[PDB]
From Swiss-Prot, chains A, B:
Activated by cannabinoid that binds to the vanilloid binding pocket. Diphenylboronic anhydride induces pore dilation and enhances cation permeability by promoting the conversion to a homopentamer. Residues 506-531 dip into the membrane without crossing it. The lineage of its organism: Eukaryota, Metazoa, Chordata, Craniata, Vertebrata. This is Transient receptor potential cation channel subfamily V member 3. Homotetramer. May convert from a homotetramer to a homopentamer to allow pore dilation. Interacts with TRPV1; may form a heteromeric channel with TRPV1. Interacts with SNX11; this interaction promotes TRPV3 trafficking from the cell membrane to lysosome for degradation.
Amino acid sequence: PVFSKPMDSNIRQCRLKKRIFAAVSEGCVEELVELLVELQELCRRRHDEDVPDFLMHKLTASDTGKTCLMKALLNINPNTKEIVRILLAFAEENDILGRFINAEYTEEAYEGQTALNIAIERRQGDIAALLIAAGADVNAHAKGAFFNPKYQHEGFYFGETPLALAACTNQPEIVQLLMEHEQTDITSRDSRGNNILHALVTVAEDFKTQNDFVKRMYDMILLRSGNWELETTRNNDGLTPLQLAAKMGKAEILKYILSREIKEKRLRSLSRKFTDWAYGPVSSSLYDLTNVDTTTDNSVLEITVYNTNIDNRHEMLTLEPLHTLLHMKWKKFAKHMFFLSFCFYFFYNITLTLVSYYRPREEEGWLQLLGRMFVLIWAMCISVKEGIAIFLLRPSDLQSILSDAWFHFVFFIQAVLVILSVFLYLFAYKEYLACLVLAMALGWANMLYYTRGFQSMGMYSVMIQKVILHDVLKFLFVYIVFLLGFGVALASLIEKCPKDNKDCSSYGSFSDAVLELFKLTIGLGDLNIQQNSKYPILFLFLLITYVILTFVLLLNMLIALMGETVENVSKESERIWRLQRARTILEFEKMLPEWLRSRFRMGELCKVAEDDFRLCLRINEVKWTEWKTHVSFLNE
Amino acid sequence: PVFSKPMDSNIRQCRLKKRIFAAVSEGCVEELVELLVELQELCRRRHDEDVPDFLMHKLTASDTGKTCLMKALLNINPNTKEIVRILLAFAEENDILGRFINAEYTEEAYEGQTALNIAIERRQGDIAALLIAAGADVNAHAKGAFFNPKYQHEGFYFGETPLALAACTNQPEIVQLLMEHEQTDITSRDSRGNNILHALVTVAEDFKTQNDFVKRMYDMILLRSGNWELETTRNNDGLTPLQLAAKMGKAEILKYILSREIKEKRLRSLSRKFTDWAYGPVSSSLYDLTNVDTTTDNSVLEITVYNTNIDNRHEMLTLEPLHTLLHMKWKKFAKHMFFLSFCFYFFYNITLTLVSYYRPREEEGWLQLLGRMFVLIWAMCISVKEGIAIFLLRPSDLQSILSDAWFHFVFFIQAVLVILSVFLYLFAYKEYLACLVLAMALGWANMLYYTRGFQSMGMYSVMIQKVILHDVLKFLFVYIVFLLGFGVALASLIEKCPKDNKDCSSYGSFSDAVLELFKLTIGLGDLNIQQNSKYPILFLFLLITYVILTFVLLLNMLIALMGETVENVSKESERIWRLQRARTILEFEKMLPEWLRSRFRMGELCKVAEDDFRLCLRINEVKWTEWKTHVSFLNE
Ligand SMILES: CCCCCCCC/C=C/CCCCCCCC(=O)O[C@@H](COC(=O)CCCCCCCCCCCCCCC)COP(=O)([O-])OCC[N+](C)(C)C
Ligand SMILES: CCCCCCCC/C=C/CCCCCCCC(=O)O[C@@H](COC(=O)CCCCCCCCCCCCCCC)COP(=O)([O-])OCC[N+](C)(C)C
Ligand SMILES: CCCCCCCC/C=C/CCCCCCCC(=O)O[C@@H](COC(=O)CCCCCCCCCCCCCCC)COP(=O)([O-])OCC[N+](C)(C)C
Ligand SMILES: CCCCCCCC/C=C/CCCCCCCC(=O)O[C@@H](COC(=O)CCCCCCCCCCCCCCC)COP(=O)([O-])OCC[N+](C)(C)C
Ligand SMILES: CCCCCCCC/C=C/CCCCCCCC(=O)O[C@@H](COC(=O)CCCCCCCCCCCCCCC)COP(=O)([O-])OCC[N+](C)(C)C
Ligand SMILES: CCCCCCCC/C=C/CCCCCCCC(=O)O[C@@H](COC(=O)CCCCCCCCCCCCCCC)COP(=O)([O-])OCC[N+](C)(C)C
Ligand SMILES: CCCCCCCC/C=C\CCCCCCCC(=O)O[C@@H](COC(=O)CCCCCCCCCCCCCCC)COP(=O)([O-])OCC[N+](C)(C)C
Ligand SMILES: CCCCCCCC/C=C\CCCCCCCC(=O)O[C@@H](COC(=O)CCCCCCCCCCCCCCC)COP(=O)([O-])OCC[N+](C)(C)C
Ligand SMILES: CCCCCCCC/C=C\CCCCCCCC(=O)O[C@@H](COC(=O)CCCCCCCCCCCCCCC)COP(=O)([O-])OCC[N+](C)(C)C
Ligand SMILES: CCCCCCCC/C=C\CCCCCCCC(=O)O[C@@H](COC(=O)CCCCCCCCCCCCCCC)COP(=O)([O-])OCC[N+](C)(C)C
Ligand SMILES: CCCCC/C=C\C/C=C\C/C=C/C/C=C\CCCC(=O)O
Ligand SMILES: CCCCC/C=C\C/C=C\C/C=C/C/C=C\CCCC(=O)O
Ligand SMILES: NCCOB(c1ccccc1)c1ccccc1
Ligand SMILES: NCCOB(c1ccccc1)c1ccccc1
Ligand SMILES: NCCOB(c1ccccc1)c1ccccc1
Ligand SMILES: NCCOB(c1ccccc1)c1ccccc1
Ligand code: NA
């Protein structure tokens, strides 16, 4: 990144004020005392009306706003605490201690950063305790391009508050010192709208390491708060800390929140998992479904399934209510809607076939009327439905067209070519055969959409798409190099044939020469040596050189590259069809009306505590492997 | 190796002097005292004019120059220190202690080795302290074929000085004893021109192990020197210890020197990295660019990119100023010069194509004149530019023609065949078509040079070259064995055909028989059994035997060997295009004039200290992963 002005500067890029910053940096105590006396006497020699203002302009930098207190804290030495006790005592007789401890940068990239923001970051618990006990602001919002970047490489976002700075830098002794302070606003929201619990989700990691202080900071702040105000708070985008963990793909944080159970009464009401009974490996629990089920707009189940930015959707959709809601919707409507979508579309491809095969060749019942009117209606049903999904779609397709958004185009292109064949055949035109045949060939080719979501057949549609997009299209630029180079080369040697006998040279034009050289590449060629040219040996040299390069080397090079794609999909094949069915379920739920979706709703009302009635889900879990390993070491 | 004379010898390959060497070896003290009295009395029985000379010829070997003091130190026993104290006291009454402790080998392979060179190597800190306190030379240069070899298997190079012997054999207690000695010349240069810091680079290793004493010896000697005299010293080849680490490929040493930062004032001026400010994971530093940027002749960036001898160029070009200078040159001129080199060469291949396809067949505008004159100029621009690069190139091509120096020939051969086609077409000749077509086919084939340096397309040009050079050409000697063996075999059975009907046997000659047997190998053949010979079954046996060997076994054996090459390049594919672009940048910088290269220069003048103004580079680094692991264990 770049900021065009440093935070601290001690190297110059090629007199009372400049010596004070050169005294608080190295740690010269006896020099700093002699310099402050020279500035204490320099207040009254010309005026006594402006004492509190003139004392501040000689201790602050006029370009950044950095004070002499900030300069001592940016440069940590073992003589640091002695400098702070002198500078805070110097503002006592001048009565300027109120504005000296609450100063901030006036520069646009570090605006709002105070001396308390530096002392907590340098791990100075004794110095930060002296500032708060003197009048430092515990609610100072450090804005700016450095503290509020646009990406995670152009600064450092922690939450803009001193409570979020100690929480993100693993310092719980300062968090306990700030939460006991009665002027600290815990539920404060920064420029992003994030509170103390949104900012911990942002700095969290995606997987489980050895030390997880973010989960420890999440539990410590939430239980000492003792309310739901931090959890129901939404951002400027309208996201809770539960929904933010699903958006950014933090599976360890999303697992902890969504099965949080507190056994202690006076603290039990802050739970989302409620175990009813347990007997060995069998447990029965109640799970909160407040923002999880798809009854609100931006629900957690809708985020995780449609989150193409992240890599761990299979880890997050295996979690504790998310796998059961996804399974119960399949056994109620989504298996029925997938079977009928197969049946109405397989009947649609047969009717396209039997009107394309039995077309009126030269001369130009109730079941025949039932067939052709079904073609005109079902093609308009797809072109409206798939046309909305393309319009409601963003142009950054590198992550959505993996297996998902590729089918939204080919069902739409096939539906338009059926409709375009109607306008051509009826009016006056003969180009209907060019549109009806290509729609029928693409119509049968779209039957591989119904192989998706199954353990045995789900990986075949991914193998076809990933070979075309990642192996074949990047290999056309290697092969057209040799197809167009040798194509003009062999066509230039062919002499103009004497008048008759058009089968005297197959390479007699550039359009001819590309055809046979494509046949030598795939192996349907002919090494003809008749070939009436003035250079028979030179034609025979470039013809065999083409066969060795394309057929022997470049053809088997592509097969070795396509074979690496097939084995990579086959290793991930158990994770593919589980994510294919998960998107198929939620698209079928959006096709349902409101009166029918209300019958399909899961959940029952519970009595958690006094004035607490939330929507639950009873999930009977049995864990044999986790039980046998648990019992074994209690009696080793 | 071989030296034809040993250092120490105790085994004979099938009388006062020979008993002394047989006394200092085993450790006989009471025998050695009785032998020295017999030699003390043998000085005066025939002359008293030559006492200091005659006392030395009976204690030294006349063939090697080895003394009795060296013989006791080569044979370490627990009775070693008692022998040294007697022999050094024996030279006191004879007043020959000055030449007895400073003696050396007169043999050509061990010349200059003294008793101090042996005592430090055998780990004798007490014996080496007694020699220096008696008058031993601390600046004795041990030359010779053993101590100055030509390769790293024909001797032991350490630096030829006793200070470099204790530094390379991990003995810092003797290094501290030598650097406090006021006659020790630290900045001494041996026969190679190496000083104390060049010799540590030579004995260093390429990667990071558990114990790195070479980096510890580099830091200990440099900080106690306290000057830049050891760093600015160049060899006989003109290399600093910074440039020697880039030449020999020591990435651990080159990383330590190029980000050396000393926080301590009185020692800060020996730094090359200067951290300006740090706030969490974000750091801003200034890097020294004295011999790093390409403004001097033998710069570190020019060495590492063009160092085909080493295997770790990707590890060294990732380092701390080397990755930023390589990235800033791409975003200023090298991306523009690569795009226009694509555009002027793609226009050049079209104009060659449209004059080769539309040639005057039988009978023999301003845009047509603009095209053909562009061919005559652009072919002369390549033939001059690529002709210099072949002339300035060494004949040891096994490491430069991997992906790099192969393109310097094929752009040159293509440019000459365009020029050769002009002299043939204009004068009187008809062989212009044999040169224009082969230049046009090779001209389109050189378009894969512009796929280099990209993450998606950079590995394809390496896969084509490595399959030809390492799989195909070593398999021709396997296949011509079977092509020439069966080719004469099947042509010898073919009887001379009765007069007419030339299509009676396709194997009627050796030139004919190689053609169809090449077609059976690739799979375009015919198992014809008509074949008018006197041995129809014996012809049919050798024909099917050829198909099973070549098409079934030897063809798929090559495909299995080519497939191992493709998967090895595909695993290294992220390291290939980063090294392809790095050579493309520095070749474009050499094409720039001096006035335009001065505008593209990076760096600003800094004030490091008093009388210290060097060229810097501000690099804003952010390290999220290295910060989250660092904070986690400080508050575990
Ligand atoms: C303009 C357009 C408008 C469109 C109108 C639509 C909009 C309005 C829609 C309204 C619909 C209303 C909702 C549906 C409610 C029905 C309830 C039901 O029975 O569902 C059931 C399915 O029932 C079945 O019979 C499934 C049959 C087997 C399917 C096999 C999948 C393969 C499909 C072909 C692929 C071949 C692959 C080969 C290669 C290609 C649910 O499943 P289950 O059986 O209950 O689960 C068993 C568990 N249990 C019994 C314990 C509970
Ligand atoms: C997944 C998808 C896989 C498959 C998709 C692949 C699809 C590929 C399909 C290919 C089929 C090709 C059909 C050709 C049709 C005729 C063309 C023509 O007119 O040529 C004419 C000139 O011929 C020349 O001289 C060629 C010169 C072209 C210049 C090349 C620049 C662009 C190439 C960029 C590449 C470099 C990039 C480098 C990057 C590394 C010859 O004309 P004619 O034939 O003799 O006509 C007879 C005239 N008559 C009819 C009146 C008698
Ligand atoms: C890359 C891996 C390499 C190894 C693996 C190989 C497999 C992959 C390789 C793929 C490379 C593709 C090479 C195709 C060769 C075309 C031949 C040709 O020129 O056509 C004809 C020209 O016809 C025309 O005049 C109009 C052009 C129509 C050509 C359409 C062909 C398919 C296009 C793309 C299909 C997309 C499919 C996508 C499926 C995923 C032949 O000419 P003619 O009619 O005989 O001459 C008439 C005479 N005249 C001169 C008087 C005019
Ligand atoms: C090793 C892997 C094995 C398995 C994989 C296989 C792939 C790799 C294998 C490679 C092996 C190569 C075998 C080629 C077969 C030659 C056929 C021949 O003899 O030509 C002709 C002779 O014509 C002549 O008389 C002049 C010679 C021209 C030959 C040029 C062929 C290409 C040369 C090298 C190209 C370099 C390309 C390099 C690309 C990287 C045929 O003879 P005829 O004209 O029909 O007879 C005339 C009649 N007469 C008897 C009266 C005279
Ligand atoms: C006799 C012979 C004499 C020869 C005369 C020459 C000698 C004298 C020469 C003198 C030249 C002087 C130096 C150049 C100064 C220009 C400045 C510039 O804009 O550079 C810029 C290029 O900007 C572009 O225009 C790049 C366009 C895209 C290139 C894509 C690469 C693919 C190229 C084809 C591959 C196809 C592969 C397909 C398969 C093959 C630098 O990049 P950038 O944009 O700045 O980077 C963005 C960063 N920034 C904007 C934030 C800063
Ligand atoms: C990457 C590159 C890949 C591709 C490149 C590969 C390129 C290969 C290309 C190959 C094409 C070959 C074309 C042949 C041209 C004619 C030759 C000839 O005249 O033969 C004659 C004798 O025939 C014999 O008897 C052969 C004996 C040769 C001795 C071999 C020793 C050296 C081989 C060392 C090997 C062992 C080493 C062992 C180590 C393991 C027959 O002549 P004719 O045919 O009857 O002519 C008709 C005469 N007339 C015209 C007047 C009528
Ligand atoms: C998986 C769930 C299944 C979903 C529903 C699927 C069920 C679909 C079932 C029926 C769909 C058809 C209804 C469309 C009505 C119009 C038909 C038409 O075009 O007329 C044709 C009549 O038909 C024939 O005679 C064709 C005979 C070959 C059909 C092959 C059987 C396979 C498809 C069928 C069975 C598939 C069974 C699938 C499994 C049940 C014209 O034929 P003609 O007599 O020659 O007329 C003369 C025309 N001429 C003058 C130009 C020559
Ligand atoms: C891949 C794209 C580039 C293709 C190669 C381009 C590079 C070439 C670079 C330099 C070549 C320069 C010399 C050739 C010019 C004269 C040729 C000639 O006149 O033909 C002669 C022989 O015909 C032949 O068989 C010639 C063989 C071609 C030479 C290829 C070099 C070997 C490289 C192999 C590597 C394999 C290729 C690369 C694989 C890695 C004439 O025979 P004729 O026809 O019977 O005519 C009779 C009339 N006349 C005698 C009066 C004339
Ligand atoms: C990526 C950056 C691009 C860099 C610049 C690339 C731009 C290059 C643009 C133009 C290059 C041409 C300039 C050379 C001028 C001489 C041409 C010539 O020989 O005359 C030919 C005229 O031309 C034709 O009529 C040929 C038509 C087929 C061309 C196919 C288009 C692809 C290449 C072009 C477009 C590529 C576009 C690429 C993308 C922009 C001869 O044809 P004729 O009428 O039959 O004459 C009769 C002769 N006869 C009597 C013997 C038969
Ligand atoms: C690889 C390079 C070397 C190739 C093998 C060399 C080694 C051979 C070593 C020893 C062979 C010694 C005996 C052969 C001599 C007489 C043959 C004969 O006369 O033909 C007879 C039959 O023709 C046949 O089919 C015979 C089979 C060929 C013999 C191969 C041995 C089996 C090895 C298998 C291993 C596979 C090979 C190796 C694969 C690993 C006659 O039939 P005719 O033709 O119709 O003529 C009729 C007229 N007449 C009856 C009057 C005659
Ligand atoms: C507006 C039309 C533009 C031109 C049309 C371009 C693309 C659509 C046409 C074909 C694309 C798909 C072809 C089907 C072939 C293989 C995929 C099998 C289905 C699967 O993946 O399992
Ligand atoms: C003086 C001439 C001597 C004879 C010529 C010998 C060799 C040069 C000719 C051809 C070599 C290159 C051919 C191109 C074919 C495949 C490589 C693709 C480009 C790449 O590598 O990606
Ligand atoms: N057979 C249980 C596999 O789990 B399922 C699953 C697991 C992880 C991610 C997505 C889904 C599942 C499959 C179909 C319907 C509901 C859930
Ligand atoms: N919207 C018109 C057809 O939509 B359906 C559909 C079309 C293509 C892919 C998937 C579904 C459909 C959905 C449920 C039952 C029957 C058909
Ligand atoms: N995109 C960062 C990859 O690093 B680059 C790189 C890394 C190691 C070796 C060589 C280069 C790089 C790539 C292009 C220009 C400059 C540097
Ligand atoms: N020297 C004549 C052609 O050189 B250029 C060139 C040609 C082939 C490969 C690499 C470079 C060139 C360089 C920059 C811009 C345009 C062309
Ligand atoms: Na394999």
